[PDB]
Design a protein around this ligand. Structure first.
Ligand SMILES: Nc1ncnc2c1ncn2[C@@H]1O[C@H](COP(=O)(O)OP(=O)(O)O)[C@@H](O)[C@H]1O
Ligand SMILES: Nc1ncnc2c1ncn2[C@@H]1O[C@H](COP(=O)(O)OP(=O)(O)O)[C@@H](O)[C@H]1O
Lengths: 306, 818
């Protein structure tokens, strides 16, 4: 009984939970009355009853402290300011310190300092939870791709994941305003960089897919125009090959966020989109030249003339 | 038959299917052009030759009214070039065998060029006589029932039906019927089908007892049944005393040689005797319990109640869509629920229509109780899931607003369901036939502002029933039952149940008479108000200690003030109500021991003690002052002053918040302290306050996640929150309809799917297990979530002057007033 109480104190901070602590305290209170008179006359009952009533008094503060808001820095400053003591940093980082060290801080009398510390921790936790979301969300969230005429892997329903990343940027740039968030500032900036690189990657993927499928209905199947634009057709085929390699690399990567970690990726996207734009401009020039070669073509339109 | 050419028909309702579903559309990710219904069927007819199309004739009809935009893609098809012009891909040629039809009644939104390009056929009059229509309807019913029932009994009954009613007196009946006031009425030529179908079904219901009685008595009972059916179908929209007048009329004109139709006429058939005569005055008594004051599944039997129960059950068994009409306080929804849930053959699907409810919402609602099966007759099907019939209760069908060219699209969708018994699956692009999923709905008269007049097609295809306020006496008995139940708590004054009910009914009648929309457009009084005040009395008594007669009268008057007069303006109206309460009490109460009964002279609150009771003015003032001092200590520091009016408002707000439904409408002017007095009262009970944060581009999604997180906090951790919503917060109509739904309903009907549905389910699991509750029934989990949100959520509305158009819409909304 007293051994159970000592075990509860010696159980680490991360290993104790408020629900299990409440159940254990209920068991202690229930079994306190079952003790014979001889045990109660002994000091064991006095010590156990005092300790369990003390733990009952500090139940709510433990509930407040047990949220995911608190980081090891918060507990470090709690121990420094209140208990005027320190716990080994390796044990503090993994949140394994005895509940006795928590209690010797006299949580009841010093409840205001712990309350303001918990308020700051919750202010940082409002940021932390939104961080966790993107963290695991974009961790995978890959682009579902299919097959077109045995060619590239075009992404299906890509606009929804596009919009997801866009709103993730909006929320990451709006959470930058907080009272207690300066802990993950380097992490926050790292996440910002990752998602901004991804945003540019996505706004160029939409454009490159659009133009590649535009010219793919123009080149690659009808040899007449392919022979009519041999240099442009060769450039388009080379771009198709390199972008196919890029898509295979990114799709067997299986990690949307890690796509930025592939070197010469954004540069490849930029050169690809610039070359595609130039190819489309040259194609439009050829269209206009052919229309000048034959005035009646202006009625047929681009698709019909192609 | 004339040419021996096969016929191909495809019926499409225009407004139901959008352009990207009808003609298809390209995908804005790879420009893959989706087929769409019309283009798909055209492709099947033209490109595919396995089907017979050279020898056959192919016919496409657009039953719904057409708008130029839909034919803006068909005008080329309508043009002499005879080619389909797709936005993407090749242009589909169309053969002469591919004919196109259009059907409508309104030409306001049709270009004259289309009129020139099409062939116009007009119907300036009816196509058939009344008698011929009736005869065809009987033939239809006979052929519908022959393939199921015995042929000889069918022969006997159909001969007796043909020889039962003669068209000559029927003409007089219908002509006199036209000479009668209807609500959303249509010409008798439309109600003929409802009358005949109801009659034939109900006479077929008594098949087993048609072989052992004399044919004279069989003729008598068949005349009784046909008279009853004609009454109910033809005059179901009548006032009810005009129903009695029509009863007398048809009694006179129709043959008197048979057993005569009476007002409260019914046959209690039992296999003990040839029980077929007229039965009346059979109302049974019901004993209830004290806690059953507010369970929205409670109804009290009356003659009108049982009559409407039986008529509704008969016409559902008649397999016909039904639409209900009545004043906003007529009680349609809950009497319908009590009529339908107890049924052992029908399943309740209560769905509230919005300003705009998309069709796939109804499709999902069907999915929750149906499944897709594939047969040969109808290929894909959407029939029932269990064995009991599935009937969906659409609510306020007139609430949805028409499109930019008129006509409500999902109203036509319901027309498609209940006319052609199916619809078209938009992605599958194949017709699906339903299996007897009936349609029931209730709508206030369009004379009520904010209600669009309904298209005659929809009203014609269904049947109309109007039920009004059940007189004054019927209210007296029902609230006498309520008051005996409420006096089960206090047996001291059991015999005083009648005076309270009589006083309440008389006060309600006088409130209706004195105050009307002539002053302003919210002086509407309904039996719902009486039910709310009896609940208030029940809560006061249950929470309060033993009360003397004077105490009971005082609390009754206080609840009368809080239910009736708190919506009143001016002081002339207020003192008029005051003196009205004086004469009401004096007439309906012998005890003369009350003092002044005015608002200032009544001070009932539970904030100063555990027991709700009359309390001293000064003590309440001191308590409020101390709490306000605490507010200045910790809450927002604003120069504030305490007076009697704001103290009275604090009492009102506390009483409203302690109610089970803390849905409050606070109407006044600005700078009066309302938006902060509500915070004060909320903190008095220690609630949680959330105020929405809006912007100049705040879409629906902002209020969506704010409302969802508030709901979760009220549910996941039982925060017991209070919501303050201001006239500034309401600017768009989307979250307007969201709030209207969350008020009229109790949950979110459009976001509880997929991952949201699963997290709701697992959160219910976690909360029930943590609380030690064994509740694991999914439907009962949904109902318990409804109960939790109802028990823990309180929303209050702070509004500017009602003269504002937005404020006028706020006060005039049905759910918000209700
Ligand atoms: N037969 C009855 N049994 C019980 N309550 C009734 C009956 N008739 C009317 N009422 C009361 O009258 C009120 C009117 O309801 P109402 O606002 O018309 O509902 P709705 O408009 O949603 O159909 C209801 O709250 C109901 O309690
Ligand atoms: N009873 C009162 N005594 C003193 N000031 C009041 C009172 N009621 C309202 N006010 C004034 O109104 C302001 C608070 O806004 P409020 O009246 O709650 O806005 P609204 O009534 O438009 O919701 C305060 O600045 C205060 O000066």
């Amino acid at each position: 009984l007293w051994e159970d109480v000592q075990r509860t104190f010696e159980t680490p901070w991360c290993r104790v939970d408020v629900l299990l602590l409440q159940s254990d305290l209920a068991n202690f209170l229930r079994r306190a009355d079952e003790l014979p008179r001889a045990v109660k006359q002994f000091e064991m009952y006095k010590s156990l009853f005092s300790q369990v009533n003390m733990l009952t008094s500090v139940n709510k503060i433990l509930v407040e402290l047990k949220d995911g808001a608190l980081k090891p820095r918060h507990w470090n400053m709690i121990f420094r300011d209140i208990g005027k003591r320190q716990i080994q940093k390796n044990l503090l980082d993994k949140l394994e310190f005895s509940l006795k060290d928590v209690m010797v801080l006299n949580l009841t009398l010093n409840e205001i300092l712990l309350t303001k510390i918990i308020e700051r921790a919750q202010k940082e936790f409002v940021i932390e939870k939104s961080l966790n979301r993107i963290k695991k969300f974009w961790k995978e969230a890959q682009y579902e791709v299919i097959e077109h005429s045995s060619g590239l892997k075009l992404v299906r329903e890509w606009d929804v994941l596009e919009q997801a990343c866009k709103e993730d940027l909006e929320e990451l740039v709006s959470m930058k305003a907080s009272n207690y968030y300066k802990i993950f500032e380097q992490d926050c900036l790292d996440l910002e960089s990752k998602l901004t690189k991804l945003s540019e990657i996505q706004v160029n993927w939409v454009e490159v897919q659009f133009y590649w499928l535009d010219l793919y209905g123009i080149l690659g199947e009808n040899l007449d125009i392919q022979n009519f634009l041999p240099l442009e057709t060769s450039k388009f085929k080379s771009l198709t090959s390199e972008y196919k390699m890029i898509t295979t690399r990114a799709f067997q990567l299986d990690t949307t966020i890690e796509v930025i970690h592939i070197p010469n990726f954004d540069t490849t996207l930029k050169l690809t989109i610039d070359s595609l734009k130039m190819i489309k401009s040259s194609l439009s020039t050829f269209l206009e030249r052919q229309r000048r070669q034959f005035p009646r073509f202006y009625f047929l339109g681009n698709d019909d003339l192609l | 038959i004339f040419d021996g050419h096969a016929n191909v028909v495809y019926v499409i309702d225009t407004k139901v299917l959008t352009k990207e579903s009808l003609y298809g559309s390209m995908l804005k990710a790879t420009l893959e052009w989706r087929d769409g219904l019309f283009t798909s069927i055209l492709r099947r007819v033209n490109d595919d030759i396995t089907g017979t199309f050279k020898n056959s004739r192919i016919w496409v009809v657009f039953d719904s009214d057409l708008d130029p935009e839909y034919v803006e893609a068909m005008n080329s098809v309508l043009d002499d070039n005879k080619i389909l012009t797709l936005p993407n891909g090749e242009r589909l040629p169309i053969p002469p065998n591919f004919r196109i039809l259009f059907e409508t009644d309104n030409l306001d939104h049709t270009t004259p060029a289309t009129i020139t390009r099409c062939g116009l056929l007009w119907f300036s009059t009816d196509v058939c006589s009344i008698s011929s229509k009736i005869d065809h309807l009987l033939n239809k019913s006979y052929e519908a029932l022959d393939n199921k029932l015995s042929m000889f009994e069918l022969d006997k009954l159909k001969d007796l039906i043909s020889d039962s009613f003669d068209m000559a007196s029927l003409t007089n009946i219908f002509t006199c019927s036209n000479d009668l006031v209807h609500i959303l009425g249509v010409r008798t030529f439309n109600k003929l089908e409802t009358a005949v179908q109801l009659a034939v079904h109900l006479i077929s219901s008594y098949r087993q007892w048609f072989q052992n009685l004399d044919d004279k008595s069989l003729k008598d009972v068949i005349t009784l049944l046909i008279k009853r059916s004609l009454l109910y179908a033809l005059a179901g929209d009548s006032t009810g005393e005009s129903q009695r007048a029509f009863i007398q009329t048809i009694n006179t004109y129709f043959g008197h040689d048979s057993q005569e139709l009476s007002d409260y006429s019914t046959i209690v058939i039992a296999n003990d005797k040839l029980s077929f005569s007229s039965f009346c005055s059979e109302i049974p008594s019901v004993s209830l319990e004290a806690h059953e004051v507010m369970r929205p599944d409670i109804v009290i039997p009356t003659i009108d109640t049982i009559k409407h129960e039986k008529i509704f059950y008969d016409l559902l068994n008649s397999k016909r869509g039904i639409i209900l009409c009545g004043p906003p306080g007529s009680g349609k929804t809950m009497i319908m629920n009590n009529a339908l849930r107890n049924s052992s053959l029908y399943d309740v699907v209560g769905i509230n229509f919005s300003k705009d409810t998309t069709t796939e919402h109804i499709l999902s609602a069907l999915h929750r109780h149906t499944n897709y099966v594939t047969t040969s007759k109808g290929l894909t099907l959407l029939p029932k899931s269990d064995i009991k019939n599935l009937v969906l209760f659409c609510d306020e069908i007139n609430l949805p607003k028409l499109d930019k060219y008129g006509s409500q699209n999902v109203v036509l969708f319901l027309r498609q369901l209940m006319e052609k018994q199916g619809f078209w699956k938009t992605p599958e692009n194949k017709w699906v036939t339903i299996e007897r999923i009936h349609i029931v709905g209730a709508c206030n008269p369009p004379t009520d502002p904010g209600r669009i007049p309904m298209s005659e097609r929809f009203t014609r295809h269904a049947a109309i029933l109007y039920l009004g306020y059940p007189s004054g006496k019927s209210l007296s008995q029902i609230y006498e039952i309520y008051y005996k139940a409420i006096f089960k708590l206090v047996p001291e004054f059991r015999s005083y149940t009648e005076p309270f009910a009589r006083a309440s009914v008389h006060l309600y009648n006088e409130c209706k008479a004195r105050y009307s929309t002539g002053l302003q457009s919210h002086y509407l009084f309904s039996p719902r108000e009486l039910t709310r005040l009896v609940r208030g009395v029940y809560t006061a008594i249950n929470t309060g200690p033993r009360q003397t007669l004077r105490s009971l009268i005082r609390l009754w008057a206080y609840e009368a003030w809080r239910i009736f007069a708190d919506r009143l303006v001016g002081v002339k109206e207020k003192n008029s109500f005051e003196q009205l309460l004086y004469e009401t009490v004096d007439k309906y109460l012998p005890n003369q021991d009350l003092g002044n009964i005015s608002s200032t002279s009544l001070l009932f609150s539970g904030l100063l003690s555990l027991d709700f009771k009359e309390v001293n003015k000064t003590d309440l003032v001191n308590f409020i002052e101390e709490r306000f001092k605490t507010f200045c200590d910790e809450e927002l520091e604003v120069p504030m002053v305490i007076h009697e009016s704001m103290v009275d408002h604090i009492l009102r707000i506390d009483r409203a918040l302690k109610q089970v439904q803390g849905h409050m409408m606070l109407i006044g002017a600005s700078r009066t302290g309302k938006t902060i007095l509500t915070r004060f009262v909320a903190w008095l009970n220690g609630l949680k306050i959330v105020q929405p944060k809006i912007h100049r581009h705040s879409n629906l999604s902002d209020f969506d996640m704010i409302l969802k997180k508030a709901i979760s906090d009220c549910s996941l951790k039982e925060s017991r929150t209070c919501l303050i919503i201001d006239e500034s917060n309401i600017l768009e109509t989307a979250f307007l309809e969201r709030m209207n739904t969350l008020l009229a309903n109790a949950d979110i009907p459009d976001l509880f799917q997929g991952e949201e549905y699963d997290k709701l389910l697992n959160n219910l699991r976690n909360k029930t297990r943590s609380l030690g509750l064994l509740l694991d029934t999914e439907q009962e989990l949904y109902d318990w979530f409804v109960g939790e949100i109802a028990k823990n959520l309180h929303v209050v509305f702070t509004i500017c002057d009602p003269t504002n158009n937005k404020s006028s819409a706020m006060i005039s909304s049905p759910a918000l007033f209700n």
